[PDB]
Amino acid sequence: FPRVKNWEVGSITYDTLSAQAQQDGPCTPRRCLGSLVFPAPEQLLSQARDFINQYYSSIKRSGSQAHEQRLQEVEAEVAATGTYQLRESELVFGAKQAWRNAPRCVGRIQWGKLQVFDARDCRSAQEMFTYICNHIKYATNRGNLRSAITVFPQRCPGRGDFRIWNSQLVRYAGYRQQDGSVRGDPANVEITELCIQHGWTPGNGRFDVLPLLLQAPDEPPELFLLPPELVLEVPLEHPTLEWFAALGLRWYALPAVSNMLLEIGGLEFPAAPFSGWYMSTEIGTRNLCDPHRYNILEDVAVCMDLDTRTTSSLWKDKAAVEINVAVLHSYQLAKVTIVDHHAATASFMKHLENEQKARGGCPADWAWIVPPISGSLTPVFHQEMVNYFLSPAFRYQPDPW
Amino acid sequence: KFPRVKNWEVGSITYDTLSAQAQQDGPCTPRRCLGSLVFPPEQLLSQARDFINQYYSSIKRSGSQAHEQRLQEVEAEVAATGTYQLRESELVFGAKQAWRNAPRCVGRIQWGKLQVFDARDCRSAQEMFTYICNHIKYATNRGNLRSAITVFPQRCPGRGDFRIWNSQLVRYAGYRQQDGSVRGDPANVEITELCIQHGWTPGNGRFDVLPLLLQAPDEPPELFLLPPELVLEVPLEHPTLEWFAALGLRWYALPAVSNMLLEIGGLEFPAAPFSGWYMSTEIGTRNLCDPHRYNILEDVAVCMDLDTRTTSSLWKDKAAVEINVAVLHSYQLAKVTIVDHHAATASFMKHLENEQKARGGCPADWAWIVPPISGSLTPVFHQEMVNYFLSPAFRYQPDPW
Ligand code: HEM
Ligand code: HEM
Ligand SMILES: Cc1cc(N)nc(-c2cc(Cl)cc(CN(C)C)c2)c1
Ligand SMILES: Cc1cc(N)nc(-c2cc(Cl)cc(CN(C)C)c2)c1
Ligand SMILES: C[C@H](O)[C@H](O)[C@H]1CNc2nc(N)[nH]c(=O)c2N1
Ligand SMILES: C[C@H](O)[C@H](O)[C@H]1CNc2nc(N)[nH]c(=O)c2N1
Numbered sequence: 033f034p035r036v037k038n039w040e041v042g043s044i045t046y047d048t049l050s051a052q053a054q055q056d057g058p059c060t061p062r063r064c065l066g067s068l069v070f071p072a073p074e075q076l077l078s079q080a081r082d083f084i085n086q087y088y089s090s091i092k093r094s095g096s097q098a099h100e101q102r103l104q105e106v107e108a109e110v111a112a113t114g115t116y117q118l119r120e121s122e123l124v125f126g127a128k129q130a131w132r133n134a135p136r137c138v139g140r141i142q143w144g145k146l147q148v149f150d151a152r153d154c155r156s157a158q159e160m161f162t163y164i165c166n167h168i169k170y171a172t173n174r175g176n177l178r179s180a181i182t183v184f185p186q187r188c189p190g191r192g193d194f195r196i197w198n199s200q201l202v203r204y205a206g207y208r209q210q211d212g213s214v215r216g217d218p219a220n221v222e223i224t225e226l227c228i229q230h231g232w233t234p235g236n237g238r239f240d241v242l243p244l245l246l247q248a249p250d251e252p253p254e255l256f257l258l259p260p261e262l263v264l265e266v267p268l269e270h271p272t273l274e275w276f277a278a279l280g281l282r283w284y285a286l287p288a289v290s291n292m293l294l295e296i297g298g299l300e301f302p303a304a305p306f307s308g309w310y311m312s313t314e315i316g317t318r319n320l321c322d323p324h325r326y327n328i329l330e331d332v333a334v335c336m337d338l339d340t341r342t343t344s345s346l347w348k349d350k351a352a353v354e355i356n357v358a359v360l361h362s363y364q365l366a367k368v369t370i371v372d373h374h375a376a377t378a379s380f381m382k383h384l385e386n387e388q389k390a391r392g393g394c395p396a397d398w399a400w401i402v403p404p405i406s407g408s409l410t411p412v413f414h415q416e417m418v419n420y421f422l423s424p425a426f427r428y429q430p431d432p433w
Numbered sequence: 434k435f436p437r438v439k440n441w442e443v444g445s446i447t448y449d450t451l452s453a454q455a456q457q458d459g460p461c462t463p464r465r466c467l468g469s470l471v472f473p474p475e476q477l478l479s480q481a482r483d484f485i486n487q488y489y490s491s492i493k494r495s496g497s498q499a500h501e502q503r504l505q506e507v508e509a510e511v512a513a514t515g516t517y518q519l520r521e522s523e524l525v526f527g528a529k530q531a532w533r534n535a536p537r538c539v540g541r542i543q544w545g546k547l548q549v550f551d552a553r554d555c556r557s558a559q560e561m562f563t564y565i566c567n568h569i570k571y572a573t574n575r576g577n578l579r580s581a582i583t584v585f586p587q588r589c590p591g592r593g594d595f596r597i598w599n600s601q602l603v604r605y606a607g608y609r610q611q612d613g614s615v616r617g618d619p620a621n622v623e624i625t626e627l628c629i630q631h632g633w634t635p636g637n638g639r640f641d642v643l644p645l646l647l648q649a650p651d652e653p654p655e656l657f658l659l660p661p662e663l664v665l666e667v668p669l670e671h672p673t674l675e676w677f678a679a680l681g682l683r684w685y686a687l688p689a690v691s692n693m694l695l696e697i698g699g700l701e702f703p704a705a706p707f708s709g710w711y712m713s714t715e716i717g718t719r720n721l722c723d724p725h726r727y728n729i730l731e732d733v734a735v736c737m738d739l740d741t742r743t744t745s746s747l748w749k750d751k752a753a754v755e756i757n758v759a760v761l762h763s764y765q766l767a768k769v770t771i772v773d774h775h776a777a778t779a780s781f782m783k784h785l786e787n788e789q790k791a792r793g794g795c796p797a798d799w800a801w802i803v804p805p806i807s808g809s810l811t812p813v814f815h816q817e818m819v820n821y822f823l824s825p826a827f828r829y830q831p832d833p834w
């Protein structure tokens with residue numbers, strides 16, 4: 033039973049939930065690989081067995097009539113068809129637990145407040161687009177963002193997968209350039225090509241929203257433009273540095289991840305986009321200041337009068353703090369939900385306390401929970417954590433191309 | 434079998450073949466990752482062969498005359514006496530390799546420049562004291578700091594051990610009050626109680642240098658006042674916040690770690706203090722801002738007139754950067770060697786490439802190589818890393834009680 037200490041306070045707990053980690057991960061006693069980014073009817077039955085047990089525990093009906101019935105049921109359907117079907121309530125629970133179990137998500141204090149949209153009757157790439165537009169519209173909610181997930185038909189024997197090819201519903205083009213560079217966001221160079229290759233007329237700005245590439249089973253991907261008024265965006269300004277609006281920077285309101293696989297009781301939903309709201313450091317630090325992304329740090333620092341000839345002046349740390357201030361002010365000026373790394377990490381500490389009393393522990397990836405600026409100023413820096421994989425879960429999956 | 438390791442800023446891919454060795458099994462298993470945790474007769478012969486085998490390959494001398502010869506003398510030394518002594522160059526070679534193998538040390542680009550003082554012919558604390566004092570004054574060198582280690586006698590059964598009872602050689606007092614709360618450094622509260630228990634005059638200050646408690650085998654400790662002209666300290670001023678000086682903060686110049694156990698070739702020296710120079714964030718962010726340390730962050734933010742009434746103003750981030758600017762400025766004006774986290778991380782990347790060429794890898798502990806402010810603004814943040822245990826090594830060890 034791993035003993036875990038908080039160093040700010042001195043307190044100590046033991047992560048007994050870790051001892052039930054099912055699917056296994058990348059470390060051995062020889063070597064830790066925690067820092068790596070990307071590390072049969074009988075088994076479907078025992079996964080499904082396990083999830084059903086979970087679900088009946090969470091409704092306070094373990095060992096009951098309905099419980100054993102549903103086991104008998106699920107086995108009969110795997111025997112007859114090779115798969116089975118989630119009931120709707122079971123689906124809502126399995127998607128909430130997936131969020132709860134996500135080790136690298138700092139936002140998990142909210143895991144119980146999740147709007148689940150059932151798209152499992154979906155039928156083409158065209159219906160898919162309509163369900164997606166509805167999701168974006170419900171979640172954006174004019175800037176008062178809500179947490180939502182839409183679940184498209186499960187992977188099943190005989191038919192291909194639904195897939196969203198875009199890593200997120202809202203992404204900006206990244207055009208490789210004349211002189212070997214990139215206009216727009218360089219993380220989206222590949223999907224940008226794919227879009228042009230599938231009939232998109234490119235733009236040439238730095239913040240061009242990309243069309244959606246949607247894949248119906250056994251179909252090529254289909255291109256869909258998002259209606260402009262569905263994509264709420266936020267012009268970035270700085271409360272005191274007024275030249276900052278002359279950078280022309282923007283970001284969008286809704287973070288909607290769309291390339292992850294949701295696994296519930298052995299079933300796999302390769303298309304199930306989900307969305308919450310941003311933490312300011314994703315936008316301010318990573319998306320804008322990463323050397324391999326928009327890379328605005330030096331330009332801000334020059335403008336700020338800072339001496340960028342020596343690193344001991346800490347120009348990078350200064351410019352980056354003001355970039356974050358701009359991101360929070362901008363989102364509050366526009367009345368668009370946003371959480372800063374101090375509030376986010378503080379409520380994550382509340383999540384670890386709630387979870388220790390509930391399940392005796394909480395899967396957490398320290399290097400992803402700790403923000404990329406001001407780490408030891410947040411309380412999660414001083415919290416030891418145990419990283420492991422519980423099911424239901426969101427998994428990464430390879431790109432459909 | 435050879436971990437693939439990627440750099441996300443550039444896209445480069447390398448393989449850690451060096452990971453193949455790894456003696457003292459790490460704390461992680463395929464079911465849970467524990468990387469974030471701070472503190473996770475004739476066996477002597479195997480450890481001794483391998484260390485000697487290292488030595489000779491590192492001087493292009495494996496499998497030649499003096500190597501097989503040196504293999505016999507240790508065979509005979511342990512056969513006769515159940516232990517062995519190290520040739521002076523081997524002790525030199527082991528101390529440098531241990532440093533080279535410290536996964537959490539970001540300064541290992543310096544690993545080949547180490548001054549080893551052999552203190553093995555030692556007995557009594559009154560003698561250790563002058564060994565420690567020659568180190569300190571050689572290490573300090575009037576602010577032009579120099580890496581040194583002093584190795585006190587190894588260990589045998591039936592006999593006590595040399596131990597330094599302080600974690601560092603320069604530690605500041607920590608006194609409680611009519612209400613538990615601490616004046617001085619709360620990290621040292623415990624060893625401050627012992628010095629007072631062992632008849633030391635407690636001061637009335639936030640920055641009283643503690644006296645060493647040195648211990649000779651099978652004997653009680655003995656207090657020692659360090660020569661006040663030997664303790665080089667740096668008063669903290671900010672180059673443009675004129676009031677910062679008046680806050681009366683100081684830190685000492687020499688980070689000198691006197692509680693880890695040097696393990697070379699199968700022998701264990703529980704007393705082997707090493708020293709280098711500080712990285713600025715160690716002082717500015719960890720020591721002066723950690724909630725359980727000096728915790729000055731909010732008192733600096735009031736003086737800068739920042740808005741402490743909401744965390745979205747990023748006042749913590751703002752005050753922390755200026756504290757760090759004051760540390761770098763104060764040390765440079767005092768002409769004392771110090772390195773900022775940008776300069777240090779870039780050098781550590783350079784170390785990683787050196788070591789990939791030399792030894793096909795490098796054990797590195799991501800969570801401690803990435804600095805505690807401005808993490809993703811340094812290149813090590815975007816470097817995947819592999820953590821494992823090589824020998825010779827430094828190890829943590831029980832407090833001497
Ligand atoms: C409501 C506000 C939310 C916030 C503030 C938040 C925050 C974050 C952040 C900062 C990350 C790290 C991502 C990065 O650095 O690129 C992350 C990862 C992640 N989040 Fe959340 N999130 C929220 C909602 C959600 C929702 C609604 C879901 C799913 C239903 C979710 C599932 C995930 C997953 C699957 C990951 C991948 C991490 C892993 O592999 O475990 N999050 N989150
Ligand atoms: C020359 C400049 C050096 C710098 C800037 C430096 C920096 C650091 C830092 C920042 C840490 C993290 C420790 C903490 O956060 O409390 C560390 C750990 C450590 N350093 Fe260095 N260091 C230097 C020299 C040395 C030398 C000379 C030695 C010994 C020969 C050494 C051996 C270690 C060891 C054993 C650790 C413990 C980490 C571990 O392996 O678990 N360092 N160092
Ligand atoms: C729902 C949600 C909220 C949020 N605040 N963030 C995310 C996020 C998740 C993943 Cl799995 C990947 C990314 C992309 N990152 C490189 C910035 C963002 C997701
Ligand atoms: C030689 C050296 C240089 C440096 N720059 N740092 C260290 C250090 C090491 C450890 Cl094992 C612990 C600490 C103390 N920490 C609480 C800050 C400092 C050591
Ligand atoms: C190599 C390194 O592990 C990688 O850059 C990780 C580190 N921690 C992170 N943490 C978060 N939240 N998001 C990230 O993208 C990363 N990247
Ligand atoms: C719990 C967590 O592992 C612990 O607080 C670590 C994190 N990273 C650190 N990094 C350094 N350099 N020093 C530390 O003390 C710590 N503390």
Ligand SMILES: [Cl-]
Nearest residue numbers: 287314315319
């Ligand atoms: Cl993003």
Ligand SMILES: [Cl-]
Nearest residue numbers: 688715716720
């Ligand atoms: Cl220190």
Ligand SMILES: [Gd+3]
Nearest residue numbers: 271272273274
């Ligand atoms: Gd102005």
Ligand SMILES: [Gd+3]
Nearest residue numbers: 735736737738
């Ligand atoms: Gd005034």
Ligand SMILES: [Zn+2]
Nearest residue numbers: 059064461466
């Ligand atoms: Zn690990």
